[PDB]
RNA sequence: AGUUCGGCCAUCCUACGGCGGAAACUCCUUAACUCGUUCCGAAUUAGGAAGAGAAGCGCCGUCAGGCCCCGCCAGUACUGCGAUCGGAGACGUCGUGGGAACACGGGGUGCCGAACU
RNA sequence: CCACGCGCCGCGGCGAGCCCGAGGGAGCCCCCGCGGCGGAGCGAGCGCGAGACGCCCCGGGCCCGCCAUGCCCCUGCGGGCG
RNA sequence: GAGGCCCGCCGCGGUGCUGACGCGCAGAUCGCUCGUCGGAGCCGGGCAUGGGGGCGAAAGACUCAUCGAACCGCCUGGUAGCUGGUUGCCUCCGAAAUGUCUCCCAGGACAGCCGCCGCCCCGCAGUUGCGGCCCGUAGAGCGCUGGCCGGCGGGAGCGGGGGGCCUGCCCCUCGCCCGCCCCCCAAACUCCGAAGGGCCGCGCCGCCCCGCCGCUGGCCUGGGCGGGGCGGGCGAAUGCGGGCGGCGCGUGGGCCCCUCCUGGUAAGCAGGACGGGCGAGGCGGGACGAUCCGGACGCCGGGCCAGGGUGCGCCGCCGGGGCCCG
RNA sequence: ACAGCGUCGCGAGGGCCGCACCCGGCGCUGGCGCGACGUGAUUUCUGCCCAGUGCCACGACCGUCACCGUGAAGCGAUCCGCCGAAGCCCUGGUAAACGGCGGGAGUAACUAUGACUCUCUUAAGGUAGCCAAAUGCCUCGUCGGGCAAUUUCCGACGUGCAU
RNA sequence: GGGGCAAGAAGACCCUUUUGAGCUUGACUCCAGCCCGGGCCUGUGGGGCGGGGCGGCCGGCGCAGCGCACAGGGGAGGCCGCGCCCCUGAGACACCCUGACGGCCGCCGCCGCCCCGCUCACCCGGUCGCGCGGGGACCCGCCCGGGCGGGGAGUUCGGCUGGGGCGGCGCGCCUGCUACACCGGACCGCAGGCGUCCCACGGCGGGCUCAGCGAGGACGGAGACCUCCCGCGGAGCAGAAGGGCACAAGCCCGCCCGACCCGCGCCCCCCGUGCCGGCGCGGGCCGCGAAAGCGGGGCCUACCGAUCCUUCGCCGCCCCGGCCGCGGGCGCGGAGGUGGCAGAAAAGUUACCACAGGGAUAACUGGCUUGUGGCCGCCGAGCGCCCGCAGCGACGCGGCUUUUUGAUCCUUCGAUGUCGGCUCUUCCUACCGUCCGCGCGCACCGGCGCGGAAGCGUCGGAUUGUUCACCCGUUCAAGGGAUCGUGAGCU
């Protein structure tokens, strides 16, 4: 599918509708200091093998894509999660 | 009578053939602008007024089609509730209730409010 | 069956209270004897903090906290008021 | 005089008999018949190797009547949704085999039914009558969505032909195209349209005046919500007191008889549904049958009499009309 | 099991095993040795295939691939680089390693048969032999022999379910 | 020895159990073992070659100048053997002369690597320590880190299922049926779908009418194109199906993104719980249109997902003895997920096999059904020289039977021993011969068809476990029932 280069959307920090430019959301690098990551490492240490469930059978063709939108005037950030698409791209303005 | 706004939306529709316009409505006649057309002033937007019933329309008229109303179809088809009711059955009685439909024959064929002239 | 925990019911004492806790009293079932639990909640938390009715029940209305919103002002991201 | 040579005794093995025995002489014995018998032979004593270890000319064989992982004690009275059993009496009430889910489908949990405990005062119905809405099943029909068999027409279309034509559709015929008809049809067709079901109503009507509303309107408009007067009354039958909580238990394999079913060629077949029945309902009948026809139960004495019967077993019948190789 | 037959590793600062550890066995041995495996006396032979999977290569040194160590940056927790040992990868070898070893169509002057072509298709397409075998489904195959009579038997035949 | 489904024996057959064991691998998760690096153990040297600390050496034109004033310079004094602001440049070379040492000799516990020794640590061999060697700061050991590793461990190896498996996915969802006119009603019942696709295929306003018949017009026809007509949708609206829709929900055009934000309720499923989808709202903030109005996507009914963990936004809160930076936590609502779809992390095998149970269930007997297998009767298209019927007999039609086989699981798993034979006994008639009639397309002979008839006979053998099958013979040779008669009768 396609998303528009900018969509005029409500921006909460301004409190009014204003144009928002668009990118695509991605997972951030996971820190080794996340509470759960720290716990998983501790559990793994020591003999006994895998201490937590490992999801193995993936059944989903593709992930719903979240479009990050930034309002230029208010620096607002907003995200619209489109339905699952095997390929989506941001149109050039 | 006719207009403008309406309510039920064919008894108000369809196709045809008559009749009528005083007023109304339409037709009509023109782009100087406003406006308007994948092209086209056809439609549309303006600005009118010489006409005109040819249409539209208002009325009739069709052993017209439809749409509608009543019979009849018919206690018929089905079916509710019982039955040591018959029948090898599947089917039909009997008792006690509820009762269609298509056809077919007759008859129809808009009415209502508000403002206005 | 017993122990312990829980839910609820019935009873008995006392009532914004209530309670043989361990213990200690030449004391024996007697006497004295804390926490705890309840009486305030709500919000992740910073924190803030219930009265308005009422035989009872039940809804309604309000109040408190949390999430907003808009006004006003001191000891101000503080207070109050809707 | 040689040989992992041959026959053959003891020995050492154990082939057959499928012999005897088979509660045995015996937890492997006995009889004949056997294989071998100088050899990789047999036998006794000492010793070594120990349990996921040993040992094995391998058969998962053997390791003290145990071996595809010994034996003894212990953890341990391990765990089981799985089997079996679970101890006096009388009385009162009395189910479910269903729904959603769950690594569930031999089980549970929540809900339903049900028991006890109650508490509280409003009215109540698996009913009929009357009023107003709903429905698309049977029937019926083929308008619509498709199936369907043949007649009667009328022609622009030679589609082919048969063909008089210089030739040609210039010559006719059926198809084709419509038209009138007609034969049978539907689960996934509806012009219409039942029976039968569902839902809601059947007491408080008016009149009049304000009150209130950051709600609604051009308004003095509303819409709601209150208070006071002033008129009228209880306005379908029948039966009948309702309402609500608390706390648990079993149950969550069901099966039949009707009736409509799906499906399979069809069943004491496999799935659905209204009701009833058995489950968990004694008793009488149907010869016999958990469910059929009656009747649904304290202990009894009379009487009545259902369903089914009335030659005799075996309680109880005669009369009349018709029929007759049950 | 066996003699025979091959293959494999290893020259003791070693191999293969035991083994909580200390230490052991082979070995009081030394390649005519010791361990590991196949096949199973002769007689006669052992075809083709290294694609794949194993195994082997100071056979390389690419790409990958760690700890450290060392660069930067930071207030420091730290965070990014870089280096990169084996190993994998990569390149060869190896089937008495495990294993594998194809189809259509047209044809001779008896008819038929198919030496002969043609066309796909493989790492290679099954060679010498052998066959209804203890291996052949069809199948109680066909044809001989043996019987009065043969789902057995034997000699043949053999695109042979599946040698 | 016919029965007491005579007793064995909580069936090892077939299932089921969130019951196991032995084995396997390329299951899941791992561990010894070994290989491989870096440290430590662990000394004493020689270097190469960079680095590296010292460590000399020299620098130096806009020069406007007194003159390569490097800059930084500066005074008018001294000691070249000379000056001098303001020279111009900012400050001219007087007694004057110059940073980072800018380039650039030698010395040192400097680091990095590639070597090369030595002996003394650490090992190893000989010997009666009888007149000795070898290796060497490397291996070894150890600590870390990477490999390899069924050689072992531990464990798992879904479900429904007319037994199980296999396949199928009524495992999550949607349309039309089935479904038997509210609703709710099942089937490894009946046709199809869904996991997407589209910032346009969206929102909104405007204009329009769509398929198609007709009948006409250069090339023009089968087909291309344009017109007046009539057109209830016979078009279209993404995709299944069914509903829905005409100055529209179609089609075209112009604008825009409501395919917003903040908080709530209702309906579907339903235990009246989620979840998906919808819907109705209260506030803001936008869009489109003259406006009323409409819009939280694509007409409706399908098109997706809890805890924990991760990530990202947005405002705040907390680190508990304070304070400041960093970082962690949290509230908040989005993503990343569980398709077995209310959501374990997971391969086979077992004839060496155990359990606990179950006919809640397969096998083998039964019994029910009867497609199948036979056996009858109805009709006559026809055949038989002629001629429906002496014998036949199509296409159809109706029955029987248990002798087969399917279906179904009603009974049996703390067990009813299982095929065929041998042996022996009874029974049936749906009769092959013998007996009695009767008809022939019966001269005789022999055949054939009926009705009655179950007394007697239906044998010997070759292959095969055979029942069967087949063949050879003969006094020429029917078919079947008895828990598929007949294992403390046997084999």
**How distant is C1' of D315 from CA of A46, in Å?**
94
C-beta pairs of A10-13 under 8 Å, 24+ apart in sequence: A10/A78, A11/A71, A11/A73, A11/A74, A11/A76, A11/A78, A12/A76, A12/A78, A13/A71, A13/A74, A13/A75, A13/A76
User: How many helices, marked H, and strands, marked E, lie in chain A?
Assistant: 1, 6
Contact A78, A69 (CB under 8 A): yes
The gap between A47 CA and F142 C1' (Å) is 21
Q: What is the resolution of this structure in A?
A: 3.3
Tokens coding A56 = 């193995």
Q: Give strand letter and number of the nucleotide nearest A31 (CA to C1').
A: F310
Measuring from the CA of residue A87 to each C1' atom, give the nucleotide at the shortest distance: F197
Structure tokens at A12: 């909460």
Q: Which residues contact A24 (CB under 8 A, 6 or more apart)?
A: A65, A66, A67, A68, A88, A90
């Amino acid at each position: 599918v396609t998303y528009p280069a900018e969509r005029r959307t409500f921006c909460k920090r301004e409190g009014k509708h204003t144009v928002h430019k668009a990118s695509l959301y991605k997972k951030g690098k996971d820190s080794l200091l996340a509470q759960g990551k720290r716990r998983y490492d501790r559990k793994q240490r020591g003999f006994g093998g895998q201490t937590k469930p490992i999801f193995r059978r993936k059944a989903k063709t593709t992930k719903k894509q979240v479009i990050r939108l930034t309002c230029s005037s208010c620096k607002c950030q907003t995200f619209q999660v489109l339905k699952r698409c095997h390929r989506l791209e941001i149109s050039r303005l």
